[PDB]
C-alpha cells in the first residue's frame, strides 16, 4: 500500500488530539461518514467530493496509514471545511464543528514543531 510510518507528531495527534475530540460531547455527528441518504441531505455528495470523518482519521492513525502529520492535519481540515461548505452558518452542526475545531487548534498549538520518524 502507500508508505506509512510513525512520527512524533502523528503520535501526538493520536494520543493527545484525537483522544480529546473522540470523547467530546459534540463529536457524535463526526465519528462516522455522513450518511446523506439516511439524513435526507440533498446534493451532499455532489457538493462534498472528499468526505472525511473522525472515524476514518482514527483508523488511519491506528493503522499507520499516514506518512506525515500534515496528511492527518489535512484530513481534519477537510472534515471541518466540508461541514462549513454544505451546512448553513447558523445550523447546529456548524456550531458543534466550530467548538471541536477550537479544541483541535488548542491542542495542535502545543504539537512538537519538528517531525521526526520513530
Amino acid at each position: 500500500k502507500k508508505p506509512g510510518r510513525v512520527t512524533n507528531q502523528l503520535q501526538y495527534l493520536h494520543k493527545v488530539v484525537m483522544k480529546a475530540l473522540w470523547k467530546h460531547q459534540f463529536a457524535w455527528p463526526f465519528r462516522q461518514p455522513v450518511d446523506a441518504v439516511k439524513l435526507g441531505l440533498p446534493d451532499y455528495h455532489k457538493i462534498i467530493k472528499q468526505p472525511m470523518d473522525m472515524g476514518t482519521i482514527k483508523r488511519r492513525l491506528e493503522n499507520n496509514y499516514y506518512w506525515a502529520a500534515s496528511e492527518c492535519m489535512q484530513d481534519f481540515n477537510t472534515m471541518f471545511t466540508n461541514c462549513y461548505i454544505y451546512n448553513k452558518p447558523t445550523d447546529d452542526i456548524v456550531l458543534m464543528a466550530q467548538t471541536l475545531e477550537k479544541i483541535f487548534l488548542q491542542k495542535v498549538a502545543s504539537m512538537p514543531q519538528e517531525e521526526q520518524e520513530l
Binding site: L41, D91, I93, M96
Partner: peptide
C-alpha cells in the same frame, strides 16, 4: 440526535 438533520439537534 437530530430533530432536523444538521439544522437542529435534540441532545
Amino acid at each position: 440526535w437530530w430533530i432536523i438533520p444538521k439544522v437542529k439537534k435534540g441532545c
